[PDB]
Ligand binder design. Structure first.
Ligand SMILES: [Cl-]
Lengths: 181, 190
C-alpha cells in the first residue's frame, strides 16, 4: 500500500476535498486523470484498503485521517525508488507521474524533499538521453541517407530523444519554480 | 483476445530478426522496451499464442557443443497480420485518448512505424495525421484551462503554482507529441 502510488493520489484528492466513493472517482477523472489512467473499480478497491490502515475515515463521505495525512507527508519525502517499475526511460519510468502527484499535494510533505527528487530524476533522464545520444551517433551517423527500416528506426529513436529532453525541460521548470519558493 | 498490442510488437521484432526465446526477450528490451514495459514471461506467452495462430514458426537450429536453439520467425500469415494492424485505424474507445501522457497511440504508432514497409507507410501516414489532430484538441484544451485558470502565473503560490507546473507538463507533452508526429509525417513525405 505504501509502495504503490494510487493510494497517495487519492490521499491528495482527499486532502484538498473530502468526497465520497463516486464523488472521488468523478473528481479524480478530471483533476489527476490527465496523468493517471485509473478506473472506478480501482479507486474503490484502494479506498477500501485505505480504511484498513485507518488512512481514511467514514465521515457516506470519506476523510483523510491523521495517519493518512502522515503517510502522504512520508511518501512525498520518500526518495526515488531503485525498485521502481520502468527505470531507464521517460516513456516507461513512472517517476514523472509520481512527481506530479507529490507536486500537487505538497502541502502534506515538504518541497525541499521533493526538490531533491526532481533533481535526482533529471540526472537519470540525462543518463537516458546520453545513452540515446550514443546510439544516434554510433548507429545513425549522417541522418540523411536513411531509407526505409533504417529511417523508421531513427525516427522512433527520435521520439525517445524528444521525450527525454521534454522530461528534463519540465524537471528544470519544476526545479526552478521550487527554488524561488 | 489474439489481436492486442504486445503480439504485434513481437511480430515487428521478429520481422527485424528471427530470434529465440532469450534473444527475443533481450532484443525487445534493448529496442522496443524503451517505449514498452513488458515482462519476459509475457513475451514468451504471446510467442506461444502466436505459434498456435501460425503467426510465428519455430525452427530448431543446429549448434555443435551447444543446446540446439529454437528460433522463431514471422510467417506469411503473421506478416499479413502485421500489415493489417498497421493499416487498422486508431480506436475511439481506448483509454487515456485525451492526453499524450495517457494515450498509447503514440506507442502503437512507434511500433507500426518500425515494421511499416513500402505498402503500409501510406495507411500509417493516415494515423499520424489523425493522431496529430487529436493532440491539438488536447493542447487547445490545456491552453484554454491555462488562460481561464492560470493567467498571470507570476503571482502564483503553493497549490496553485504546483497545479500549473503539472498542467505545464501536459502542455509540453502534447507539444512534444505534435512535434514528433510532424517529424514522422515529414520524413514520410519523401
Ligand atoms: Cl507459413
Amino acid at each position: 500500500p505504501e509502495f504503490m502510488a494510487l493510494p497517495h493520489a487519492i490521499l491528495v484528492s482527499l486532502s484538498e476535498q473530502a468526497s465520497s466513493g463516486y464523488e472521488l472517482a468523478r473528481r479524480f477523472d478530471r483533476s489527476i486523470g490527465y496523468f493517471w489512467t485509473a478506473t472506478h473499480q480501482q479507486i474503490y478497491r484502494t479506498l477500501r484498503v485505505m480504511e484498513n490502515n485507518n488512512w481514511v475515515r467514514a465521515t457516506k463521505v470519506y476523510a483523510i485521517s491523521d495517519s493518512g495525512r502522515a503517510e502522504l507527508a512520508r511518501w512525498i519525502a520518500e526518495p526515488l525508488s531503485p525498485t521502481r517499475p520502468g527505470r531507464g526511460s521517460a516513456l516507461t519510468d513512472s517517476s514523472t507521474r509520481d512527481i506530479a502527484v507529490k507536486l500537487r499535494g505538497a502541502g502534506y510533505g515538504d518541497v525541499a524533499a521533493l526538490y531533491t527528487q526532481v533533481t535526482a530524476l533529471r540526472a537519470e533522464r540525462v543518463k537516458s538521453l546520453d545513452t540515446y545520444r550514443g546510439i544516434e551517433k554510433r548507429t545513425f551517423a549522417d541522418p540523411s541517407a536513411l531509407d526505409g527500416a533504417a529511417l523508421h528506426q531513427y525516427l522512433v529513436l527520435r521520439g525517445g530523444i524528444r521525450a527525454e529532453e521534454s522530461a528534463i525541460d519540465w524537471l528544470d521548470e519544476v526545479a526552478e519554480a521550487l527554488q524561488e519558493k
